[PDB]
DNA sequence: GCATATATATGTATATGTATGTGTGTATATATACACATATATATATATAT
DNA sequence: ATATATATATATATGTGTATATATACACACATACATATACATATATATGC
């Protein structure tokens with residue numbers, strides 16, 4: 001039975017038991033992130049990046065609260081699983097703050113050990129800093145095995161040292177003359193689904209310092225002792241080199257191209273709100289409210305707001321926001337009221353609209369892609385037909401009238417158009433269907449399905465019958481198959497084995513016994529008062545000797561014959577039943593194929 | 606303040622394994638686009654008319 | 656105020672000519688190349704080592 005008891009925890013146990021509430025994701029996961037202007041797939045833990053960004057945003061907010069005179073250099077050094085963030089701010093105060101429990105705890109140690117403490121619990125409408133909750137650097141202290149905070153206000157140095165996952169904590173005061181904050185912490189890896197800080201975390205932190213230096217050029221961010229220059233122009237051309245830019249006193253927006261989905265990046269003050277907010281929705285609404293009637297008058301096309309928006313990458317920057325509200329601790333969605341953001345943001349949407357209208361490299365690709373979609377929609381027009389003949393029929397394909405239904409209908413394969421003009425009278429109208437072919441027949445051994453349906457004639461054979469290249473022959477329009485390749489040696493040794501090797505792609509036609517070859521004489525000789533027939537030349541080469549005086553006729557083809565002998569060979573045929581044996585595959589490989597040393601040893605016998 | 610050492614990054618040069626030949630004609634068939642004129646035909650454009 | 660009578664230049668088409676082209680199998684046993692990558696040497700340099 002499920003136990004039902006109530007545990008009332010402290011702040012520390014509620015944080016450590018419910019970690020995913022307070023650091024975001026505590027699991028290694030994949031995302032698609034803009035790194036250095038590139039939409040690259042990353043795989044990382046957002047919790048440790050969030051822990052770095054808490055101290056980073058604390059140092060930046062120390063920058064804003066002194067109006068960028070202090071905390072104007074921020075050193076974020078990440079090496080050997082150790083983050084050292086040092087700024088030259090005025091200092092976390094040494095003055096006496098009081099707990100509600102009655103314990104008298106000094107300033108930086110109450111800021112850095114217990115949560116729900118900080119200097120952002122005052123008025124919200126004048127607070128322009130990215131911090132609200134008062135739990136952040138204490139959350140950095142909680143998920144770190146080692147955490148030292150060295151604070152100088154100019155008169156004293158307060159060292160707050162915590163260890164064993166803040167279970168050991170001690171504050172100490174030295175007389176000194178430094179003025180700034182140094183947070184040096186080594187993260188805990190027992191709760192996170194990682195063990196070390198890899199290069200993707202340092203790349204995310206360096207790209208964040210680059211974006212913050214773009215937003216705040218006065219604060220000199222350094223990573224591992226290397227300076228970072230932030231300009232909106234080079235950052236905007238890192239995304240797309242044709243991005244239209246527009247900078248304001250608080251906003252800075254760049255519009256580019258998104259060919260493989262939708263891309264975005266937005267910053268409210270110093271916060272990376274990667275999941276959005278009301279601000280990007282209001283800015284795209286104000287942009288599309290000018291652009292959509294403009295593209296309607298320009299190119300007369302009905303393209304929606306989302307279809308315009310999804311091809312754009314928008315890199316917009318919001319500075320000095322007031323009363324910022326966020327739906328989570330990680331602050332990834334600005335859920336301030338739309339009147340507040342609409343009053344604060346003074347972005348000129350019509351200038352961006354005319355600037356992307358006058359550009360031919362962003363809007364005109366949306367126009368040509370949309371008319372490509374509409375032309376592909378217009379080209380797909382089909383209807384029905386009254387008793388379609390042999391499904392996809394052919395110009396030279398005569399058809400049996402009971403073909404396709406339940407019957408024993410036979411399809412005819414010849415190579416001559418002269419050898420079918422006699423057929424339509426001498427055949428049955430219901431069971432006999434004739435079709436010639438152009439020239440000889442492709443060597444089709446071991447080669448791809450696409451390269452065999454590139455032939456008009458081979459997909460045409462597939463279109464007459466029920467033959468599909470990748471599956472079995474079950475429902476066939478002509479039940480039987482009767483092939484008449486030409487009677488000469490080129491007509492039996494080049495087109496006929498290539499044809500039956502093509503029919504070897506479905507090795508059940510031979511098994512059903514329906515493969516019939518119709519014999520055709522190549523020598524017809526008048527001897528006595530009668531005509532003797534010879535299917536092969538070697539039949540005559542055996543039987544030339546023991547015959548009397550005669551008048552020969554070599555038979556070039558069935559078109560060289562007359563309608564009477566045509567009627568004889570159709571209405572009384574000779575059906576060679578070609579049966580596939582066991583090892584047909586190696587025999588076809590040694591005949592129809594690239595290697596011919598097999599043909600070398602095979603001719604030699 | 607200076608030895609130094611080795612590490613890895615990029616020339617580089619070769620040696621792999623393929624990939625495309627086309628060879629060079631024989632052989633098999635098929636397709637193409639024009640000029641020469643009357644004879645229908647057809648199909649749809651205009652008039653009108655109440 | 657549009658239905659229809661009707662007229663007229665569109666579409667083969669005949670045969671004669673006069674000329675093009677094109678997909679394939681054949682096979683060596685190389686020919687030229689297509690990249691190509693790849694492993695390894697060495698340079699410098701810089702940051703450690705002293």
Ligand SMILES: Nc1ncnc2c1ncn2[C@@H]1O[C@H](COP(=O)(O)OP(=O)(O)NP(=O)(O)O)[C@@H](O)[C@H]1O
Pocket residue numbers: 054055058059061062085089092111112117118119120130131132133134135136137138139181183329
């Ligand atoms: N590295 C730092 N630089 C400047 N101020 C800091 C730093 N670390 C802590 N603080 C301050 O110490 C107090 C502790 O609050 P903290 O726990 O960091 O929450 P926060 O800043 O409100 N962030 P959050 O809880 O996520 O909204 C705040 O007044 C911070 O501004």
